[PDB]
Design a protein around this ligand. Sequence first.
Ligand SMILES: C[C@H]1OC(C)(C)O[C@H]1[C@H](O)CNCCCn1cc(CNc2ccc(S(N)(=O)=O)cc2)nn1
Ligand SMILES: C[C@H]1OC(C)(C)O[C@H]1[C@H](O)CNCCCn1cc(CNc2ccc(S(N)(=O)=O)cc2)nn1
Ligand SMILES: [Zn+2]
Length: 257
Amino acid sequence: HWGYGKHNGPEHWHKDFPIAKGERQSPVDIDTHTAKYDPSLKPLSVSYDQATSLRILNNGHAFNVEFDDSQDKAVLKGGPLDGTYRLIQFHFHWGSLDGQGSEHTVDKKKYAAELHLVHWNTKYGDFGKAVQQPDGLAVLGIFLKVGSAKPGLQKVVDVLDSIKTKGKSADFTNFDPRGLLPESLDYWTYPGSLTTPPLLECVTWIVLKEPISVSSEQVLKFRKLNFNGEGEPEELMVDNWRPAQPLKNRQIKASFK
Ligand SMILES: C[C@H]1OC(C)(C)O[C@H]1[C@H](O)CNCCCn1cc(CNc2ccc(S(N)(=O)=O)cc2)nn1
Ligand SMILES: C[C@H]1OC(C)(C)O[C@H]1[C@H](O)CNCCCn1cc(CNc2ccc(S(N)(=O)=O)cc2)nn1
Ligand SMILES: [Zn+2]
């Protein structure tokens, strides 16, 4: 099965998922000098006031905080998007060291981690249908740098001990994802893909320019997770990021001058 080891990491994925070498793969390097301001982009609308978190799951690749997406309760609209995208889950990608972990890069700079808030287009009815469409998903990506603690992350950090290994879940109600956002909603956007298998080319990427700060202690707790199941050889869940893929025939647009 695919993963992030020497024997099953990103350079192997194309053998089971040939779209890995496709025309709109993610992540990518954001060359800030080449990205063009697009004055036609609308302001982003992040409406998370009625969000209903349910559960946190270690899926063997990351941990997902899952939401009730059976109604419009936490939605993303505006910016490059047509229509209404419902929040289904968020997760992170992170490194073994502070100098790597992000999937997207900015002028080849790697951040310590990257948050993905995953949303699906309500016109397709369910997430499984939406991932089969070129405009099915919108992923809001937020960089993490190490410095001051992020208070709104601590409830996530403190439950990780209870989902150490693959397949463990825990109740995770009443979590407010607004506490993970930076001050500014300035962004870059481009058409891309899921960054893990099945690597489907279904994503409008919206990557915020302003990183959030998390503490060294917060990211150290990420790095104590395990890719393995309980009672299997311990393999730390670190370096669960895909490197930048070729931009090909794509333009990255900026929401800001
Ligand atoms: C097995 C253990 O030992 C090693 C050192 C391999 O890693 C350990 C692992 O963590 C656990 N042992 C194996 C399980 C995980 N795995 C499988 C393989 C080789 N097959 C394989 C299949 C599909 C793809 S894909 N979908 O195209 O990306 C890539 C590689 N390599 N790892
Ligand atoms: C449903 C599936 O059920 C089985 C396994 C039986 O076949 C599958 C079927 O073939 C298809 N059914 C599943 C849904 C399709 N899908 C989605 C996912 C993971 N989503 C995901 C979300 C965000 C990002 S990121 N990092 O933000 O870019 C990366 C990955 N994995 N699959
Ligand atoms: Zn992701």
